[PDB]
From Swiss-Prot:
Belongs to the heat shock protein 90 family. The gene is HSP90AA1. This is Heat shock protein HSP 90-alpha. Changing G82D: Abolishes ATPase activity. The chain holds residues 17 to 223 of 732 of the full protein. Homodimer. Identified in NR3C1/GCR steroid receptor-chaperone complexes formed at least by NR3C1, HSP90AA1 and a variety of proteins containing TPR repeats such as FKBP4, FKBP5, PPID, PPP5C or STIP1. Forms a complex containing HSP90AA1, TSC1 and TSC2; TSC1 is required to recruit TCS2 to the complex. The closed form interacts (via the middle domain and TPR repeat-binding motif) with co-chaperone TSC1 (via C-terminus). Interacts with TOM34. Interacts with TERT; the interaction, together with PTGES3, is required for correct assembly and stabilization of the TERT holoenzyme complex. ISGylated. The TPR repeat-binding motif mediates interaction with TPR repeat-containing proteins like the co-chaperone STUB1. ATP binds at N36, D78, K97, F123. It comes from the Eukaryota. Residues 2-208 are annotated as: Interaction with NR3C1. The modification N6-acetyllysine is found at K43, K69.
């Protein structure tokens, strides 16, 4: 059973701007997704300080980076708080309508696409390098779900019957043909060292 939904007009506008604007500094997508993982890990840690049973679904707090050259995918995994079905449908837990309005006004005044995170819509920078994005998630108060979109004005939501994850979020990037540099070990290492040096959780880069 697969459900199909339309994006709000303002969010479809944000996605078109990211895909069509000429902008060479594409590497910032990785910094934005790692920042979202760190924020989700802080939320489950705070809840555990007053209720230890919040960690019954897994005690380890970390971030894993998994490249696969055969499938042409880059996966970002975390053991954070996760998202409910309602959170996924409501723009992946963001205030995306007001965020998009502020971002567009800043660009007209002199700002650039690298400043996207200051407007709380950093997730959508994934479309600088990916043709399709799949999001697998599990929250302590709901079941495991899968969100998916290739842009074009719509997204899908279904119950996930695949491998259970315990608690957290998994972002799967199906890369564009001319963006395979983001699967090379030396390139990933360089980006993590430059932009993510003050993240307070272990970041493990897997080998092929």
């Amino acid at each position: 059973a697969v459900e199909t939904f339309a994006f709000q007009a303002e969010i479809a506008q944000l996605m078109s701007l990211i895909i069509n604007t000429f902008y060479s500094n594409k590497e910032i997508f990785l910094r934005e997704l790692i920042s979202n993982s760190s924020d989700a890990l802080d939320k489950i840690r705070y809840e555990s300080l007053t209720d230890p049973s919040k960690l019954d679904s897994g005690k380890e707090l970390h971030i894993n980076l998994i490249p696969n050259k055969q499938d042409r995918t880059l996966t970002i995994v975390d053991t954070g708080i996760g998202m409910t079905k309602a959170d996924l449908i409501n723009n992946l837990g963001t205030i995306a309508k007001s965020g998009t309005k502020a971002f567009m006004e800043a660009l007209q005044a002199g700002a650039d696409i690298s400043m996207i995170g200051q407007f709380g819509v950093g997730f959508y920078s994934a479309y600088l390098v990916a043709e399709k994005v799949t999001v697998i998630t599990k929250h302590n108060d709901d079941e495991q779900y899968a969100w998916e979109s290739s842009a074009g004005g719509s997204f899908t939501v279904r119950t996930d019957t695949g491998e259970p994850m315990g608690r957290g979020t998994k972002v799967i990037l199906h890369l564009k043909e001319d963006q395979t540099e983001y699967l090379e070990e030396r390139r990933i290492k360089e980006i993590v060292k430059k932009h993510s040096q003050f993240i307070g959780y272990p970041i493990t880069l897997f080998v092929e």
